[PDB]
Amino acid sequence: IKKKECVYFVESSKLSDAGKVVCQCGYTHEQHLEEATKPHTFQGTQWDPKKHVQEMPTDAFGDIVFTGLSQKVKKYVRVSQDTPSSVIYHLMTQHWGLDVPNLLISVTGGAKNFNMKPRLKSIFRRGLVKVAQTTGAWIITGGSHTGVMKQVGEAVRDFSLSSSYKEGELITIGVATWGTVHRREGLIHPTGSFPAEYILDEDGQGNLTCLDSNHSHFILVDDGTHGQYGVEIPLRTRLEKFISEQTKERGGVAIKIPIVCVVLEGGPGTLHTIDNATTNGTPCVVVEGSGRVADVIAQVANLPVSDITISLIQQKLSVFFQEMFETFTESRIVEWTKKIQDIVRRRQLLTVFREGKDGQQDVDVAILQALLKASRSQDHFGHENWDHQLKLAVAWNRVDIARSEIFMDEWQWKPSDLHPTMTAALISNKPEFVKLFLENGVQLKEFVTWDTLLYLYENLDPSCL
Amino acid sequence: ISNKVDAMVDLLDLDGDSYHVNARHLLYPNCPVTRFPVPNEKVPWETEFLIYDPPFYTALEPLSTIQYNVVDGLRDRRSFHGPYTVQAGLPLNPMGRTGLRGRGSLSCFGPNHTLYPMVTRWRRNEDGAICRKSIKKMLEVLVVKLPLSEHWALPGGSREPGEMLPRKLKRILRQEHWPSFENLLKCGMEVYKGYMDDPRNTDNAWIETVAVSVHFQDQNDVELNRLNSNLHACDSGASIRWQVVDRRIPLYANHKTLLQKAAAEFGAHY
Amino acid sequence: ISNKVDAMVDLLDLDGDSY
């Protein structure tokens, strides 16, 4: 029982407020606000969110099963906001039964306001099921039955009741805020939960969002507040780095796990979603024509960083943002402009999904479009980084792209370096990539050494008799 | 004909700013604080911003008797690009606004001086003759990696008064060897006497560098035969390593700015 | 038709001193 490591981050919130929310009083919570130490002695005169958020070990670490909507087993943990991403990587790897990923599609967007267009609703799942079909992709999304997070869980069901492998192997990680869960009661049992119950009622939520019903594992973060969304934003941005940058160790030194961030529509918490990701170094792709914050950064993503001003954001927040515009004050449009400028001058970590007569395909070519402009700046200080570039570039057989991106560079023609890529193009079919290597003139006669045939011969097709 | 007429179906369907970009960032290094966002438009100190309410983190107001714009005691409080202004008893950061006030994790308010030095050799290949890079010629620098870091920082920093050697190429590096390169630093060209784009800057304090560079023309000279094999290079640190100066060095971006103007004095490839 | 459509593949590719 690895409970002596993870913690509550529960809060000894001395009652020093009255906001009259949902026919209640006091600070966030109620008679359950005094856990064991109570609002007592003298701790608290102005409620500083740093002085005393004392860390006790968790009480929500088990296995949640829904009523009848999905007869399965789903494991959840109530982690804190300060747990390092090594008490948990040591916990998904071997305390849960999860493998080591090779692709980390991040699907974020809007919430509680989402009308997915009937045709865009189609490009989305043809674009998101195929990445799950291949490789060992992990789908990390917010845990809620609303938004792009309810559409990413609405296609996994289609790919679990009718698919190539049938059953299901997708690992759809759901990370959200504990405090923003409707019926947290019954999900809190000392020791474990071991098939506890979660009734999905979406009428009495009011402002307290329910969990989804088609994810795989739920990682609930906690800060000790009720109704404060946005707490689950910084922690996953080190989760998606420590998982994706310092977890694999062939090559003797280090190799980067591919990571992509897909955003459709959005809102206040969707810009802090992509700014933190791009700052960390997560390539992202925006789906233009969707709606909110995706679009406002879809048609400003090529203009100079100096052009972007408060006037431009004011004019471009009065078309995509209609009813929330009057909510936007003068201290939320000069704080929405600096973040947009910040994500713009990272022009090597941002692309756009063109809609009509451009990028006429699923979301997938767009995710490696983001990776291509991202890793073009990252093509020599990673050395081997070319090899994984092609190990994904086999997913679309981007023969024309691979010809265009490398063969018309100032390419050093690198016969030795073409061989790891040759082997990567051999482990499965890749009919045209190997011929690409033969007009380049990969001399097979020295390419195949004894260890080369070794490597080729451990990688038979597993399905052959 | 199907393939070409498929090429004719689509055939008739044819009819920035240069300001400090490191100080104005969120999450001031090693401190759970935020800065009030300052977009590129209002960075100068003359643009009228009245919602201005930046934090005051410093790892108040009787700070008089500070000789700004002059050599205040043994600190030399006057920046290279002319005197600055004082908004009571705290200096104002030139080159624009940052978003924070106070001093942060810095010694004192005003121009903090460091002396980041440059030591270079054309990389040897197998014969001594410099092997041609992609187009022009290629050089190397000596970078140092202390354990608690993620980049190959340059060997220099805060100049202790009367040291003339920047306190880090003076310690955890070559020691009991000073007199020689301390007699060589008064020989070379300056490449940048000015302001850095550190992420640690604030509206009331800033850091400045003098940047000296020394090059070694030969490979078996009397300089490279007494520099490399005379260095301790490990007191409490964890690394020392000559690195190839390319466009994507795992170095601190602020220092990579210095190299981008220093390696260019000979015709190199950064 | 191959020969003529081969003539249409290229058809839309059109847009001193006295001493």
Looking at residue A235, the DSSP 8-state letter turns out to be T
Q: Which residue do the tokens 């000894």 mark?
A: A12
Q: Are A286 and A275 in contact (CB under 8 A)?
A: no
Q: How far is A335 from chain B (nearest CA, A)?
A: 6
Q: Give bridge partners of residue A450 from the DSSP assignment.
A: none
| Cβ count within 10 A of residue A133 | 14
Residue of B214, B210, B250, B227 whose CA lies nearest to B139: B214
What are A345's two structure tokens? 């001058």
- How far apart CA A193 and CA B185 sit, in angstroms, is 68
Q: How far is B13 from chain C (nearest CA, A)?
A: 12
Q: Which residues contact B88 (CB under 8 A, 6 or more apart)?
A: B61
Tell me how far CA of residue A296 lies from CA of A44, A124, A303, B228, in angstroms.
Answer: 42, 19, 12, 55
Chain A residues near residue B250 by CB distance under 8 angstroms:
381
* B101 assigned binding-site residue: no
What are A391's two structure tokens? 């190990």
Chains that contact A by 3+ CB pairs under 8 Å? B
Q: Which residues contact A369 (CB under 8 A, 6 or more apart)?
A: A285, A351, A359
Closest partner residue to A341 among B40, B246, B248, by Cβ? Answer: B40
What are A395's two structure tokens? 């997913």
What are A11's two structure tokens? 């809060």
In chain B, the N- to C-terminal Cα span, in Å, equals: 51
**Contact assignment for C8 to B12 by CB distance below 8 Å:** no
Chain B residues near residue A339 by CB distance under 8 angstroms:
37
- How far apart CA A205 and CA A202 sit, in angstroms, is 6
**Contact assignment for A304 to B16 by CB distance below 8 Å:** yes
Q: Resolution in A, one decimal?
A: 5.6
With an 8 Å CB cutoff and a minimum of 3 pairs, decide whether chains B and C touch.
yes
Closest partner residue to B246 among A279, A357, A381, by Cβ? Answer: A381
What are A236's two structure tokens? 């996953």
- How far apart CA A112 and CA A144 sit, in angstroms, is 9
Tell me how far CA of residue A105 lies from CA of A174, A285, A370, A392, B88, in angstroms.
Answer: 13, 11, 12, 13, 52
Q: Which residues contact A402 (CB under 8 A, 6 or more apart)?
A: A390, A393, A433, A436
**Contact assignment for B8 to C12 by CB distance below 8 Å:** yes
Q: In degrees, to the nearest 5, what angle opens at C-alpha A259 toward C-alphas A254 and A260?
A: 160
Residue by residue, DSSP assigns C1-19 as: -HHHHHHHHTTT-------
Q: Are A174 and A218 in contact (CB under 8 A)?
A: yes
**Chain B to chain C, count of Cβ pairs less than 8 Å apart?**
15
Residue of A176, A179, A196, A180 whose CA lies nearest to A188: A196
What phi and psi, each to the nearest 5 degrees, are found at residue A391?
Answer: -65, -25
Q: Is A326 left (phi over 0), alpha (psi -120 to 50) or beta?
A: alpha
- What's chain B's Rg over C-alpha atoms? 24
- How far apart CA A296 and CA A301 sit, in angstroms, is 9
Q: Are A237 and A245 in contact (CB under 8 A)?
A: no
Helix, strand, coil abundance in chain A, percent, nearest 5: 30, 10, 60
Longest alpha-carbon distance in chain B: 89
Chain B residues near residue A341 by CB distance under 8 angstroms:
39-40
Method: cryo-EM
Residue B257: in which H helix or E strand, if any?
helix B253-262
DSSP, collapsed to helix, strand or coil, labels residue A65 as strand
Q: Are A39 and A33 in contact (CB under 8 A)?
A: yes
What are A321's two structure tokens? 């943002």
Residue of A261, A329, A257 whose CA lies nearest to A297: A261
A318-335: string of b/e by CB count within 10 Å (b at 16+)? Answer: eebbeeeeeebeeeeebb
Order of strands across the sheet that contains A173-177:
A173-177, A217-221, A74-78, A61-66, A196-198
Q: Which of residues 114-133 of B touch A (CB under 8 A)?
A: none
Say whether residue B143 is in contact with chain A using an 8 A CB cutoff.
no
| Cβ count within 10 A of residue A42 | 6
Tell me how far CA of residue A442 lies from CA of A344, A419, A421, A437, A459, in angstroms.
Answer: 40, 8, 11, 6, 21
Q: Which residues contact C13 (CB under 8 A, 6 or more apart)?
A: none
Q: Which residues contact A141 (CB under 8 A, 6 or more apart)?
A: A106, A107, A108, A148, A149, A152, A153, A172, A173, A174, A175, A215
- How far apart CA A269 and CA A142 sit, in angstroms, is 12
Q: Which residues contact A128 (CB under 8 A, 6 or more apart)?
A: A105, A107, A139, A152, A155, A262, A363
- How far apart CA B268 and CA B140 sit, in angstroms, is 10
DSSP, collapsed to helix, strand or coil, labels residue B219 as coil
- How far apart CA A223 and CA A220 sit, in angstroms, is 10
Q: In degrees, to the nearest 5, what angle opens at C-alpha B175 toward C-alphas B174 and B181?
A: 65
Q: Are B101 and B204 in contact (CB under 8 A)?
A: yes
Q: Are A17 and A26 in contact (CB under 8 A)?
A: yes
